[PDB]
Amino acid sequence: GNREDRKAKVIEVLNKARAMELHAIHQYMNQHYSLDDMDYGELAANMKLIAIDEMRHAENFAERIKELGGEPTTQKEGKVVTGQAVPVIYESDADQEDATIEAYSQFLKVCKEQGDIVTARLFERIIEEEQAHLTYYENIGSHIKNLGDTYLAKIAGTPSSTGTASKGFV
Amino acid sequence: GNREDRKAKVIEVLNKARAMELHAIHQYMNQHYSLDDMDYGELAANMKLIAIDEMRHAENFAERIKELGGEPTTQKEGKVVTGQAVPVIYESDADQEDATIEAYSQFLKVCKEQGDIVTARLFERIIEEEQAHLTYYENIGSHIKNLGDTYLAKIAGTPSSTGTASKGFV
Amino acid sequence: GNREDRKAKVIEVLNKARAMELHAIHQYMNQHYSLDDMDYGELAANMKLIAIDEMRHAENFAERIKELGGEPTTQKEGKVVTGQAVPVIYESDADQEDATIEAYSQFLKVCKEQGDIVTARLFERIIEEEQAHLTYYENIGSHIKNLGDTYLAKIAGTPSSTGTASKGFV
Amino acid sequence: GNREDRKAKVIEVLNKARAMELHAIHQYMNQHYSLDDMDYGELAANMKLIAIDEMRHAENFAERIKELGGEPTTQKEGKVVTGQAVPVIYESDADQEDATIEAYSQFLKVCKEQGDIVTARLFERIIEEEQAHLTYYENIGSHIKNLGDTYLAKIAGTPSSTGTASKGFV
Amino acid sequence: GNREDRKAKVIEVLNKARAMELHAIHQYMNQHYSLDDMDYGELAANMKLIAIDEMRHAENFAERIKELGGEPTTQKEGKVVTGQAVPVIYESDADQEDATIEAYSQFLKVCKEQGDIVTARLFERIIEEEQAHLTYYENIGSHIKNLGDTYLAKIAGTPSSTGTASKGFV
Amino acid sequence: GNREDRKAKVIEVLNKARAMELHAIHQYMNQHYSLDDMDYGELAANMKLIAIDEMRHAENFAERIKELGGEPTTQKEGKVVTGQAVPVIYESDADQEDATIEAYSQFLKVCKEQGDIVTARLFERIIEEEQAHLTYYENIGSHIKNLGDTYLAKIAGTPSSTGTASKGFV
Numbered sequence A, B, C, D, E, F: 001g002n003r004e005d006r007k008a009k010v011i012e013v014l015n016k017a018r019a020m021e022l023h024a025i026h027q028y029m030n031q032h033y034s035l036d037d038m039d040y041g042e043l044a045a046n047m048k049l050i051a052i053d054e055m056r057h058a059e060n061f062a063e064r065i066k067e068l069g070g071e072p073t074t075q076k077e078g079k080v081v082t083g084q085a086v087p088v089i090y091e092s093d094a095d096q097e098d099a100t101i102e103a104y105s106q107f108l109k110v111c112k113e114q115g116d117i118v119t120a121r122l123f124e125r126i127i128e129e130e131q132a133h134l135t136y137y138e139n140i141g142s143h144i145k146n147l148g149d150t151y152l153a154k155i156a157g158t159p160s161s162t163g164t165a166s167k168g169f170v
């Protein structure tokens, strides 16, 4: 394809990935609100920190799309599942991070095929972070399934802070 | 009304307010990508910083909804408009902050009528921030209208940094 | 109503609120002695710390009553229940904080109707603290119900210190 | 008496003393509110600091009672006198601290007779503090009676702070 | 009412409140010149410091009026009374702070009825400061009435400094 | 004239000057509110700092009048002009500072003629500050008239802080 076709194909998968990140942000923050509500502080905090990673992803995809002359999507991909119990949160999140790694690997190939090394490197870096999220999710789901209440007793009442408050406008 | 009644009614205006915040996060960040693309750094920076204020809003609303036994919504209210020109960006955002304020004040009244001092207090606080945001967009909107390209020449190539990067999981 | 009228009516709800705080100080400290006796240190510590918040409440109420020309009551409202078991302690206290909040909100309305913005403000502030207290007791109540003895095993033998001792006269 | 009878007799006088302390706390704080209201800062502050000493007493008696297998009273002993003038505050407080020392000395003897050295040492220590309160009260009542207005002119407008605010829950 | 309507009505009570603050600045400073002339330093100092609080009030009101599209008034409400004797100074100022509070509370109600949460919040804040001022003047008024010249003898020749001088242009 | 006549003539021009300063304070603060509203921060800030200089003047005149046995006026001299545009603010302020220097020089002569060296030195010092204000005003009015929008583009969005907040009573 010519210069314009190669950017358009790339912009396509970038918006595809962006949509997945927009879903993850809403999905992982939804669970954080429950975890926090359940007073599982350490779980609540790390869930929020992973959501903020996905925020950075959505932000990085957007910027790349702009460099390519495209418009970054505002629609999330899929529906958000609410009211999940602690066990189901980690099983579903693990499944999602695995699916996302899978999808992103396929987008990375499209980038290579359109001869776009900068976008490909973006996907490589963000895939490595996705892997770290997947490991985390798998570990927690394991301790929950294999140890139940004894494990959660240690999480009960733990601190949920994610640090100093977000530098905002006001 | 009864207990469950009062709570339900307040959860409802909180979810409306929250849906409004979800929209503003996406609307504002879309403009930030544009402003960052045009290389108006300081404009891009402040836009992003107000979006992060709106994210905190959404969060505070979701936390109060959880306290009332409700489910925090995940759907934004309204459509995000893309491709806006710089002057339209500040004319639309002023209108939105003003509409939001008008709305929140209506929600606030419902909280007083439903006997919920804690939620009304949250609305009062967030409305003053919204006022800080409205003042900001009117001012910029104002400089662009009176000074046009002379003002922009001053913003062109300014730093776009919002400070240290996102404290996340990785 | 007239001046003396408005003041009298507000002094009245303040003395009711204050009597409610006197009860809670005694009720909560009684449970603290129990919790400290069973050697659930962290539970005993936080219980005592909330009682001290209730003491500050009583104080603030008495100071406002004095400002209005009234006499701060010295009688608690209701009877202190002793011998409660750990789960009853957190089920009863949640109910009390919730009832208190319901009450204070009623008192607040009287202050607005009597044109007393300063007293209404004091009620607003103390109601948010009461909400912090209600959230606390529901959480603990929640951990005990879901996790039972596994949770307690984690609290057994923890420090009971509330920090430095009482700054006093001697 | 046997082991149980000796603890019960001790618990009796301990609850007796506790009831006196619960009265003193309400009585001395009542006067503090007046002193503060009268803008006699140094008098107001020291009255509050002595009330907090009595709080510690009520707390120490309670803990000892628990160690003995008893239930710490929640009822104060006697009625609280309100609206006393500056002179009458110090004359009555002196009389009360003297009566309390007298009573406590008699409880101490009961402790010795029940062969309870730990409770006896508690009373000895708390009696020494009561003496310090009595001296203070006597001194102020003396300066008031012997010097009146000139003495109080120096107290007018003095600071009433008792230090940094009480470590609480919120 | 409509937009322009709600704003106009609030601008009106703000300009009344502001005119009241302009009066108090002049009234209070006039007394400060007197008190400074009689060499009651501490009295002169605090009077000036409350006037500066009233200046901040006028400022905050003018800033909110500007936010509503209005013009901040420049005329004080009422006449400044000169030559007052020390006791009249504190009897009149107590009455004024009390009248002001009564007024502001009325203005506040108008803001609620006009749906203006930000202006009502400003009134709420300034009314608590006015209460701090009212408490001050009653206390001093009180010391002068109970203690007369003995109190003044204590103030005579005290420092009149309000701290570092006015950060200005030169 | 005799001792009393010389103080009275001096007090006359001192109240005359004081009245001018009371006008300047209201006039310069009025413009500050507009400049701030226009988001011309550096202009807004310096206008406020010059108003505070005029406050010090009004304060110094008052104190001198008191030393002379007089009563310091509470009436401003003239009417305040509102709603001026940026250009007209600086042209009028320049004219006012020039007129004030002119008037004050004439009052200074009256002081010399009444043989009052202390009041004369006051006028000399305050005249030197007036000169600094006049220079400032002239410079800004020059840049506005000669360079317009390009100059103001640099002022747009600048900080308006005048430093740490005014040491007040509360």
Ligand code: FEC
Residues within 6 Å of the ligand: A025, A026, A027, A029, A030, A052, A055, A056, A058, A059, A062, A074, A165, A166, A167, B025, B026, B029, B030, B052, B055, B056, B058, B059, B062, B074, B162, B164, B165, B166, B167, B168
């Ligand atoms: C809460 C919450 C939501 C709502 C989720 C929900 O469903 O409730 C929420 C929603 C979003 C959404 C959409 C986006 C995506 C924007 C877009 O691309 O359209 C989105 C995007 C971002 N957020 Fe976000 N958020 N958010 C925080 C909280 C929330 N945020 C906190 C706190 C921080 C503070 C981070 C820090 O200071 O380090 C924070 C930071 C960011 C950054 C900045 C990252 C960086 O510069 O490195 C970006 C970009």
Ligand code: FEC
Residues within 6 Å of the ligand: C025, C026, C029, C030, C052, C055, C056, C058, C059, C062, C074, C162, C164, C165, C166, C167, C168, D025, D026, D027, D029, D030, D052, D055, D056, D058, D059, D062, D074, D165, D166, D167
């Ligand atoms: C105010 C007020 C009242 C109500 C009196 C009234 O009649 O208005 C008031 C009432 C009580 C009453 C009952 C008790 C007795 C509890 C019981 O044994 O049932 C009672 C008991 C305690 N108070 Fe209390 N209070 N109180 C403070 C203020 C007030 N307090 C402030 C402030 C501090 C802060 C002290 C500090 O941080 O150093 C503080 C601390 C304590 C401690 C902690 C001592 C320690 O650990 O060394 C105990 C125990």
Ligand code: FEC
Residues within 6 Å of the ligand: E025, E026, E029, E030, E052, E055, E056, E058, E059, E062, E074, E162, E164, E165, E166, E167, E168, F025, F026, F027, F029, F030, F052, F055, F056, F058, F059, F062, F074, F165, F166, F167
């Ligand atoms: C705002 C505002 C107004 C209302 C104007 C308007 O028209 O809106 C306003 C009005 C007045 C008026 C009359 C006077 C004259 C009093 C008289 O002589 O009757 C008047 C007088 C004074 N002000 Fe004033 N003000 N004002 C501030 C703000 C405002 N002030 C801020 C802020 C500071 C803080 C200064 C600092 O901390 O360094 C401050 C300080 C002073 C000092 C203290 C100077 C010194 O001790 O060196 C004097 C005297």
Ligand SMILES: [Fe+3]
Residues within 6 Å of the ligand: A050, A053, A054, A097, A129, A130, A133
């Ligand atoms: Fe991820």
Ligand SMILES: [Fe+3]
Residues within 6 Å of the ligand: B050, B053, B054, B097, B129, B130, B133, B134
């Ligand atoms: Fe906003």
Ligand SMILES: [Fe+3]
Residues within 6 Å of the ligand: C050, C053, C054, C097, C129, C130, C133, C134
């Ligand atoms: Fe509470």
Ligand SMILES: [Fe+3]
Residues within 6 Å of the ligand: D050, D053, D054, D097, D129, D130, D133
């Ligand atoms: Fe004592």
Ligand SMILES: [Fe+3]
Residues within 6 Å of the ligand: E050, E053, E054, E097, E129, E130, E133, E134
């Ligand atoms: Fe005041």
Ligand SMILES: [Fe+3]
Residues within 6 Å of the ligand: F050, F053, F054, F097, F129, F130, F133
């Ligand atoms: Fe000047």
